[model samples]
Target: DVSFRLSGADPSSYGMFIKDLRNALPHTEKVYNIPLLLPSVSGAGRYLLMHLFNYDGNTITVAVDVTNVYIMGYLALTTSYFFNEPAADLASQYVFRSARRKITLPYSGNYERLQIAAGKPREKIPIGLPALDTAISTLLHYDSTAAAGALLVLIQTTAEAARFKYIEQQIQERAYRDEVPSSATISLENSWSGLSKQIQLAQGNNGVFRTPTVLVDSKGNRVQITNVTSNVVTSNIQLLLNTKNI
Candidate 1:
């Protein structure tokens, strides 16, 4: 709706920013784009379009504005935390469609090199450990919200942190794999309460008009699709829907 323009920024750049931001989260879990709120603030006409992402088995909610973003871990409604204020490099360079958000993500640690105390053993540390630890912990302590948000991101520098992350992800994946209908199916069902069968439609009087279906992820969180009709009954449906993840 273009509730507010970004002044000098292009729309596609913001779209790419969303892309970079989503990539920062765990890809193993489903990310849902739920209902949003765009309200004018800052004593100007500029409005903030809130994009809420629900993932990690629907336990976390990360909201991103056009220019900035917020990360929440679902502790309480009041537990909103300011995660990262984009660096100068991110806004000016990476947000542009021509430039990609190319940054190193933390990798799972390899403990194979550690041996018993038979002799002095050499420790094979992973690259970028120190830098990532400093960056993640700094933002985490400076802003507790960032710490909670980082849990799902799986960016770990210490052994304890990595262990905690592994267990959380394992439990979530277990819950997902064991489900029969799955949470995503449950979410769509709850969103739309009742529907008449195809035979009912043949009766003509039973035919009812429903609102455009909100496409959700496997976790059942609403996905923001402007073109709702194309989200269903089309070969390109997955192609378009997958862009939200991309």
Candidate 2:
């Protein structure tokens, strides 16, 4: 686990803030926590804290942009896209735990496209970007089209857990669908656990075999599985047609 706090006084300081944050890391230092300032900048420009522990092979970075109110965390792996060999073998998820519950953040950019082999076709699947973005919009009350931001003031594994929970719990009280995994619970390990799969199930058709799109929460409020994108549906339709042609 790692922890970071990104706070800048001016929006113009963002790019320079990123530069300073990156420079502070000396590579030799483990458990690095320092707020370095620039010559031209002053009065709390930006701050970042990172835990460089060797416990896990993966490097976890949790960055919170306080000025913008965004909480962004990442799990590092071999590759950023196309779950290829050496990369797929490594762990690809980071867990964020709050007091009430825990959630995992997978490598967002790492996703798959449609593939065909031996006269059989495989559907497109995405792990992190779509689900995490959607969850930020749905659970955190941020717009999906924008970057994940607007999380309140906020970690090591233990300390990191505490930080996100303080922010996560603020919005956790809202009622949402359990059967349909939201941003937090949505798995990003592979094709089997992805938004495409869940949407397919939620949007599936049949009698008793049909998946429920809407369900009554314990609060007696009706919650429907939403945030369904037309692109995913269209791609699925395309795959179905391709399979028929095959």
Candidate 3:
């Protein structure tokens, strides 16, 4: 039973676990080691580890990997020559043997702030506009027996164009009826989806087993956690997950 590496004699179990973990950490290589971004006792931007165990053994363990994780990758080669000054230790309360704990996450974003792909610029987070909502609700979810309506201003920009064409138009298009505005901007956004949960890679704090987790945010979209992060978007292949909308 302890040869190379083995588990999931059942295919279904393996598939289930894969799906679940992918939902949290799409790039995961192992199961026991998963990354966590739970809010630190002090703030929400720290990196963490979650030691999961059950009745037969363990369930929760969060720790920092210190040097093992932080000084890894391109930086490790540089730190190899250093003499004294070993990495620091446990940020959380733990046994001497369990070296994992909280530490500053190098590249995590504010949880409340949406981390997105290079698409749109959402300067101010979207808030409920009673007028906007009512207008939309009138058309989208109206009860004719209980409603009246007015047409809001038409949305003038609505061409789902290719990246190049879109960019070209923004530059070449007009500002006023006779001129092109001297300024133009392009931004990516998560439509109504907002900041849905998806795979967002967080740098492991101490880099224990240190792979980040896959989170299912209130809005379920695929979040890319690699070099870039974007909101989970509906699958183009899923075609239409619903009837009235897709």
Candidate 4:
């Protein structure tokens, strides 16, 4: 239950302060390969959850829990890379061998039972605020473009398009919902369509794109394009999956 609070005019400035704090804090020894950051709360709870696992200093291997909205995308990629034998075979092999001993499976099998007994219903709550804050702070320490791109792909592989539609609908239904005077939905749809087209173009012949390699290219490799595509696909899927709820 470690907690510290600081405020600054801009998020970027605040992020820097937090980074220094992490480094200066007592009992802070860099054990795991992951970096620390503030959490983010956007796009349901998935982003925040992923950040926690990705940056957490622990190395316990865990089984996948499909019902846990937070880890869905991470699990999907892990499964695809490890079991599906996707294009990133070399990376997957390295992760598997390196993390095997430290891995601890998450309780996927009894998720429903645990939830029932715990008496927590499947509804969004404010408990994720701190985590979200941490995620955002942490994300600020990295190249946002790459982080966003990776996040996008993870969401796309794990979520559905209906989820977005549902969110839109819910926002409309809320008493304090923002007003939409004109063809807002249409505008949003068109914008998303354009983004999708660009991403598809970047995919080119292969479905995989590496961000770091693209960065080193003088002509500004297609890294941004590829990452943008991954983000768009993932967001679309998340929106689709949650549509029914809206």
Candidate 5:
């Protein structure tokens, strides 16, 4: 497992956090607990984990900014590396583990588009969904419409049982689904696990983005949370369908 924390603070709050590796190693997980700062410039997939404080607990997981209050996370099947070779592999998925619900995306890029959703003509790859990429124009410099507001996705690996659960608990403000895996015990324990969505949740309503949503877990673990993106909310996806989706 590895830990991540910031060494420098912005005199102005540019959040010049992580461009690459760290100089030293961390002995514990909390050492890498950098504050989840919201970007100021444009829509970009800001990664939340990487070559940070390497430790024994926080190693095989990445947390990207989804909203100020919520984040998109990825966990690995094994420790230290992906289940397969190369960064792109079947075992490596943009994944989530909620009580019993596990959403795994086999492909990268905008999950909405890259995702091999069910019912597609190509038989729809089962495990792909989510969006965007991680490519900054020039480190420590310029900002553009290409950076901020995009689906912030992080990347990492490892199977730290404890640290894995640690981040899962930290990022999930709420989770709504129609059902959990068939063998999972979610539905039996959690009451708020499934429902409907797109009802204007940003300003307190669920917006129009339909589908089910809720905060409780599969075992009925209920807790209300403050919005992750209240300061500058991004409810509607306001970008044109262009191919230069950097």
Candidate 6:
């Protein structure tokens, strides 16, 4: 049996409170009670309720956090459900008790394995797709010879942005260890920036360099590279993408 002693400034008042508590949780067995003298150990002060649970082999102590509303509600509901019986019946005696007080409701569980979907090769580009249609319409405005150059630049830029976006997503999800080398970091940024500049240069002047053509230009490539490199630099310092806490 585990023993718990409760004492306070006003022994009689505390005793009455304990009596009410025992009545409320009648299943708990009380072993003993003691009174304290003022000059002697001041009775561990007031406003404290000590609960002791006895199980086999091991003993654990827990402090209750009364401020947590969810915990309070759970406790109330559990007790109301479990102890819903005739008060006079000894066999009906039961109490709802928590092993750990102030527990986080959503307890941390085992880490699940990351599942990466298999990559599927893209199919033939569909005719009349919105982007393709836009590209075709834009090209139609120019003479046949000029239209081919414009179409080629548009196709190249779109492909570049798609590739960059894919790489960016991969880097964002990959894990990195501490003590990363400066050279490794610089190499990653340079690669991202190089692709970005090509896109920007293609976008120049007319901004027909707008659509995917922007990705083919030097200036557009630089901007894309700068943005991606900046993300990598900050992510490295912050150690982001390492955990899925959220």
lDDT of 2 at 54: 24
TM-score against truth, every candidate: 0.18, 0.21, 0.17, 0.23, 0.22, 0.16
Model 4 regions more than 4 Å off: 1-97, 109-119, 131-162, 165-246
- Misplaced by over 4 Å in model 3 are 1-11, 25-44, 48-51, 54-57, 62-246
Sort by TM-score, top down from the best? 4, 5, 2, 1, 3, 6
For model 5, the local distance difference test gives 0.23
- For 1-246, candidate 1 gives per-residue lDDT tens digits of 111112232334334433343333222322122111122113211212222222211121222222112221112122333222333223222222222222211221111111121121112212122232232343333333333323322222111111122222222333223212334333332332211121112234332323334545644476642332332222111111122211
* Number of backbone collisions per candidate: 1, 4, 26, 42, 41, 27
In angstroms, the error of model 3 at 42 is 11
How many Å off is the CA of 158 in candidate 4? 10
Model 3: per-residue Cα lDDT at residue 184:
18
lDDT of 6 by residue, 117-141 (tens): 1111111112112232233343333
Give me candidate 5's TM-score against the actual structure. 0.22
lDDT of 5 at 218: 38
User: Candidate 2: where are CA atoms >4 Å away?
Assistant: 1-11, 28-99, 105-246
The Cα error of candidate 1 at residue 59, in Å, is 7.1
Q: Which is superior by lDDT, 4 or 5?
A: 4
**Model 4 worst lDDT window (10 residues):** 28-37
Q: Candidate 6, TM-score vs. the true structure?
A: 0.16
Model 4 global lDDT (CA atoms, 0 to 1): 0.27
Better candidate number, 2 or 4, judged by lDDT: 4
Say which prediction, candidate 1 or candidate 5, comes out ahead on TM-score.
5
Best by lDDT: 4
**Model 5 / residue 110 / CA error / Å:** 8.0
Model 3 residue 190 distance off true place after TM-score fit, in angstroms = 36
Per-residue accuracy of model 3 over 12-119 as CA lDDT, tens digit each: 332232233223321213211322222222321122232222222312222222211111101111111111122222322222232222222232221121122212
Task: Specify the highest-TM-score model's number.
Answer: 4
* Model 6 CA deviation exceeding 4 Å by range: 1-131, 137-143, 166-229, 232-246
